[PDB]
């Protein structure tokens, strides 16, 4: 038994020991209570954030067109509007969102997430959409008929102004798909521009876990 | 004897220190070809070690890495400081002596000076799997057309080494030799011992060999 | 004295006594772990015999092997669930049995090797999918070393893994020795590092049958004995595919 | 009393102390139960394995003739078939077997082992063999008469299809002998090739002990 | 400096560079100058239950071996 | 109070401390009882011995 065993002299980063204090006199400022306190990083991963869906080439430079997707009376039923890989941390549609940005500080994570659709059109507009989900390891539906036979939620706009799908079994290609499809064309009151929009928001749901810290890829070095 | 044995426990059949690598690097500018050096952590380099970890199909353990390092000058200064940096898998890596990958805050690093007991630190079990796999029988891709065996399984970090002092007249060359041992082993599912000499360090490829030595005749 | 097991929609008659060898002494189970609140998974009508095509055994035949679960990839409803699910797990019950007179002789070894990793015919190539699988058709070993463009380095007496062939009895195994037995049963549970993984991408174990003492027959009698294998999944599960949401 | 006593600075291989940890944050992957677990190396030393008996020069290159020994009607009673030194770890007939290979990682071992004979001929073949054992420090029997007066088990093939001899007192020339002898010639049903075979298997029996680790002799250096 | 203990019946080096210094079953001490001298204990090693300081036999099983301290 | 007091670095023969072990695995051979045991050197100092008295030159 000795205190000079191999590896007792060395400085190892990320190894915790006590250290002497520069001032062992002054150290005194009483703490006060301050509203809002964060003690875990899953307290800001379960907060909603508006995800950009629309990506063109300048509908995301000026990005107030980035968060909303056009709808029209012109379009016929059974044509999809948007869709995405569903894989946060590697798909740029939700990896620069508030929730998604936390998962670029870790490698390997799991849990479930929940997406939210909000229709922001007029209060006299009514339509029906068929939301759809494909399990991982199966391609996106190619027809509204295909989509329907999968898992689907018929969301009536004109009753509900939002819908929440809670999608289990995400973790990191293979991965599910979310697709929205017209079931009917939108019914205008008398509007002469048939522009109606919907937004989408995303947040982590309930239990979630991360392991093993690593540095983010979105900032590159010093420059000053 | 007089009681049950305990020299044939799994924990004492493994967990012995062994040399696994050594490498060289030397003081010099970032222009100079060799002035930092690296080693990728693997246990398939050394034949003797490899034999005893292919006794089992699944293992999980923490490991201790101790590096013992010597240096010598060459023909015609202050004590040298060496940095050993562990990079967890999926981190950034340096491509030269000077990078922001030695200044990164998420890669553990040990500064150590000569004339001290050799540096070491343990690395805890790292893998999203619940055990390391010593045999695998799949492909990297989701359709078979990937790389056969040892894909994203059995992937661990890697070390890097450099001097921390500025270059100064008269080159100094260091040789660092790496010792490795696992600890807290647990084994699941045994295998029959390997019979044919290892060829590749990433495949189970082998050349056919006789089962046993000849005898002069089977009768006594 | 026999009884006939039936798993519904299929029936097979078996010898009354023949023993079962439970691999590692644990039966197939459904996992009972919690924290499946964020990854719920349903359990099933696949639990029936599937009988693969019989193979000849003749004097001087060197052996055979199949790889699961990719040997049942064309079979019924079980093949559909490798294609509508991204993850799965499942144990197996395997009956290997054969005919024979009392004038035949020889014995064979039946073994299931978890994570059998094959070599490559040349010692710097890499084996491809088509040479390491053959679907529900048996692959085979060969005596006498020979090259192949990809190929497995089959040799019998290295077993395609560079280990002694006499030491393969460390894995779950049964001898079928004519003059006593003519059947064997191995029940093999799910063994893998992770609890579930993609059926197509990975192989769990490789059934193998290796003759030691070769077939031979007394005056008259058939010149071949047929072998048949029958495999039935047990206690299978697959990942969910239902929203946890609502309107 | 001091902490700088001789031999307190040094790195001694195979000496155990604690060590700081590179990551004292991440370390977390929950263990799961996995079927089959090995916690001692005598749990794979008591497993049967087929030992090669027949060694010629190419009956062990192609080694499916290595594990079986011919019998014939031609041979007369009182001629031995096979036999061996009985000394695992130095006799190549059982030192490359599963059991035998474990004892090349140790020096000095003891216990008992048990051999097993299995007749694999036809179901109408009947003969009688006289198995024999010679104590250590006594030569092999030279006649079936000699063998008989030693320790012997008359094994009737046509009742029993196997026999197990459990041989005590092995440890490491001097060492016992196992020899098999015809007592009668085999009785064929009508077979026109009188080839009948028997195999042999071996495993450690009950208590066994090893001490003092050392490296195996069957692999030589790196080469890559 | 490296000091390597080889337990009896191990491999031994025949030159400065061998795989007998890289072997994993031979204890070894790496030590640097300016430190308190290296030491380690070796525990009782022998298959016998005591060392013998006098012996009166031969190596071989018939007397014709080497007499004493075999 | 410190652990680097004078004479804490040095090797002094006939000074007892613990030491690490070369093999902390193998160490096992059970002791057996052996007839006759000496535990003190006055157990062989109280044994008779024939003393030579006669001293000439041959």
Closest-CA residue in chain D for F25? Answer: D212
Q: Are the Cβ atoms of E42 and F22 closer than 8 angstroms?
A: yes
- Judged by a CB distance cut-off of 8 A, whether residue B111 touches chain A is yes
Residue F50 DSSP class: P
Report the distance separating Cα B112 and Cα B121, nearest Å: 12
- Judged by a CB distance cut-off of 8 A, whether residue D33 touches chain E is no
Give the strand pairing for C55-57 and C183-188: unpaired
Q: Are D223 and D126 in contact (CB under 8 A)?
A: no
Report the distance separating Cα D30 and Cα B129, nearest Å: 10
Query: For A215, which of B89, B92, B142 is closest by C-beta distance?
Result: B92
Q: Which CATH number applies to C1-247: 3.90.1300.10, 1.20.1740.10, 2.60.120.20, 2.60.40.3470? A: 2.60.120.20
Query: For F22, which of E27, E36, E48 is closest by C-beta distance?
Result: E27
- C91, burial (CB in 10 Å: exposed 0-12, middle 13-18, buried 19+): buried
Report the distance separating Cα C159 and Cα C117, nearest Å: 10
Helix (H) or strand (E) run with residue C68 in it: strand C64-68
HSE-up (13 A, CA, CB side) for residue D90: 13
Cα D222 to Cα A170, B47, B51, C86, E23, distances in angstroms: 43, 5, 12, 41, 11
- Judged by a CB distance cut-off of 8 A, whether residue F25 touches chain B is yes
C206: CB partners within 8 A, 6+ apart: B137, C65, C66, C67, C68, C112, C113, C116
Report the distance separating Cα C41 and Cα C35, nearest Å: 11
Report the distance separating Cα B1 and Cα F30, nearest Å: 6
Report the distance separating Cα A130 and Cα A153, nearest Å: 6
Q: After which residues is chain F broken (C to N over 2.5 A)?
A: none
HSE-up (13 A, CA, CB side) for residue A203: 16
Q: List the domain range (segments joined by +) for residue B49.
A: 1-220
Q: What are phi and psi of A102, to 5 degrees?
A: -75, -25
Resolution in A: 3.6
Give SS3 for C130. helix
Q: How far apart are the first and last CA of chain C?
A: 61
Q: Are D213 and D106 in contact (CB under 8 A)?
A: yes
Going from N- to C-terminal start, the domains of chain C cover 1-247
Report the distance separating Cα F56 and Cα F53, nearest Å: 10
Whether the bond between F21 and the residue before it is cis, its omega within 30 degrees of 0, is no
For residue B130, which residues of chain C lie inside 8 Å, CB to CB? 193-194
- Judged by a CB distance cut-off of 8 A, whether residue E25 touches chain F is no
Angle subtended at Cα C223 by Cα C218 and Cα C224, rounded to the nearest 5 degrees: 120
Following DSSP, what letter does each residue of B129-143 receive, concatenated?
Answer: SSSEES---BBSSSS
CA quadruple A151, A124, A64, A182: dihedral, nearest 10: 30
Q: List the domain range (segments joined by +) for residue A82.
A: 1-224
Give SS3 for A88. coil
Query: For A114, which of C84, C241, C245 is closest by C-beta distance?
Result: C245
* 3-state SS record for A8-34: CCCEECCCCCCCCCCCCCCCCCCCCCC
- Judged by a CB distance cut-off of 8 A, whether residue C158 touches chain B is yes
Following DSSP, what letter does each residue of A126-174 receive, concatenated?
Answer: BEEEEEEEE-TTSPPPSSHHHHHHSEEEEEEETTBSEEEEEEEEEE---
Q: Residue A66 belongs to a domain with what CATH number?
A: 2.60.120.20
Give SS3 for C170. helix
Following DSSP, what letter does each residue of A170-210 receive, concatenated?
Answer: EE-----EEEEEESS--B-SS-SS--EEEEEEEEEEEEEEE
Report the distance separating Cα C114 and Cα C94, nearest Å: 14
**Chains adjacent to D (≥3 CB pairs closer than 8 angstroms):** A, B, C, E, F
Integer-rounded Cα Rg, in Å, for chain F is 24
Structural domains counted in chain B? 1
Report the distance separating Cα D114 and Cα D47, nearest Å: 11
Structural domains counted in chain D? 1
Q: Tokens 């509204």 appear where? A: A144
For residue A138, which residues of chain C lie inside 8 Å, CB to CB? 83-84, 86
Q: Are the Cβ atoms of B117 and A5 closer than 8 angstroms?
A: yes
């Amino acid at each position: 038994p000795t205190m000079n065993t191999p590896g007792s002299n060395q400085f190892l980063t990320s190894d915790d020991f006590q250290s002497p204090s520069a001032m062992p006199q002054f150290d005194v400022t009483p703490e006060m209570h301050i509203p809002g306190e964060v003690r875990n990083l899953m307290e800001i991963a379960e907060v909603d954030s508006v995800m950009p869906i629309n990506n063109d080439s300048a509908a995301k430079v000026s990005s107030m067109e980035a968060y909303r997707v056009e709808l029209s009376t012109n379009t016929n039923a059974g044509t999809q509007v948007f869709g995405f890989q569903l894989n946060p941390g590697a798909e740029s549609v939700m990896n620069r969102t508030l929730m998604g940005e936390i998962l670029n500080y870790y490698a390997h994570w799991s849990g479930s997430i929940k997406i939210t659709f909000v229709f922001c059109g007029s209060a006299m507009t009514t339509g029906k959409f068929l939301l759809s989900y494909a399990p991982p390891g199966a391609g996106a539906p190619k027809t509204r008929k295909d989509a329907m036979l999968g898992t689907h939620v018929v969301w009536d706009v004109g009753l509900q102004s939002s819908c929440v799908l809670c999608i289990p079994w995400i973790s990191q290609t293979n991965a599910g798909f979310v697709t929205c499809w017209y079931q009917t064309s939108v019914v205008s009151p008398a509007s002469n521009q048939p522009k109606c929009y919907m937004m989408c928001m995303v947040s982590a749901c309930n239990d979630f876990s991360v392991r093993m810290l690593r540095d983010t890829k979105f900032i590159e070095q010093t420059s000053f | 004897n007089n009681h049950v044995r305990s020299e044939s426990t799994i924990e004492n059949f493994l967990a012995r220190s062994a040399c696994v690598f050594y490498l060289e690097y030397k003081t010099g500018t970032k222009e100079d070809s060799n002035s930092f050096n690296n080693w990728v952590i693997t246990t398939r380099r050394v034949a003797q070690l490899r034999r005893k970890l292919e006794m089992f199909t699944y293992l999980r353990f923490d490991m201790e890495i101790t590096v013992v390092i010597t240096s010598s000058q060459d023909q015609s200064a202050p004590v040298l400081t060496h940095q050993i940096m562990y990079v967890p898998p999926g981190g950034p890596i340096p491509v030269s002596v000077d990078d922001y990958s030695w200044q990164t805050s998420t890669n553990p690093s040990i500064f150590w000076t000569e004339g001290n007991a050799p540096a070491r630190m343990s690395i805890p079990f790292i893998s999203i799997g619940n055990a390391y796999s010593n045999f695998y029988d799949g492909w990297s891709h989701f359709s078979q057309a990937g790389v056969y065996g040892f894909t994203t399984l059995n992937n661990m970090g890697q070390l890097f080494f450099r001097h921390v002092n500025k270059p100064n007249p008269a080159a100094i060359t260091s040789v660092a030799r790496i010792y490795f041992k696992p600890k807290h082993v647990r084994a699941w599912v045994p295998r029959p011992p390997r019979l044919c000499p290892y060829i590749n360090s990433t495949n189970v490829n082998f050349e056919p060999k006789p089962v046993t030595e000849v005898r002069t005749n089977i009768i006594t | 004295r026999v009884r006939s097991i039936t798993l519904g929609n299929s029936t097979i008659t078996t010898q009354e006594c023949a023993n079962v060898v439970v691999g590692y002494g644990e039966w197939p189970e459904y996992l009972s772990d919690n924290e499946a609140t964020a990854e719920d998974q349903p359990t099933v009508a696949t639990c029936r015999f599937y009988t693969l095509d019989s193979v000849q055994w003749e004097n001087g035949s060197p052996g055979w092997w199949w790889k699961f679960p990719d040997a049942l990839r064309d079979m019924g409803l079980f093949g559909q669930n490798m294609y509508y699910h991204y993850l799965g797990r499942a144990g197996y019950t395997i009956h290997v049995q054969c005919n024979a007179s009392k004038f035949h002789q020889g014995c064979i070894l039946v073994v299931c090797v978890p994570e059998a990793e094959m070599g490559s015919a040349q010692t710097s190539g890499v084996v491809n999918y088509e040479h390491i699988s053959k679907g529900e058709i048996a692959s085979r070993f060969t005596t006498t070393t020979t090259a192949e463009d990809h190929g497995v380095q089959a040799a019998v007496w290295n077993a395609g893994m560079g280990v002694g062939v006499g030491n393969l009895t460390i894995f779950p195994h049964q001898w079928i020795n004519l003059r006593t037995n003519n059947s064997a049963t191995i029940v093999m549970p799910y063994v893998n590092s992770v609890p579930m993984d993609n059926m197509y991408r990975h192989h769990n174990f490789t059934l193998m049958i290796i003759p030691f003492v070769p077939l031979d027959f007394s005056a008259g009698a058939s010149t071949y004995v047929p072998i048949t294998v029958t495999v039935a999944p047990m206690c299978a599960e697959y990942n969910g595919l239902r929203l946890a949401g609502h309107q």
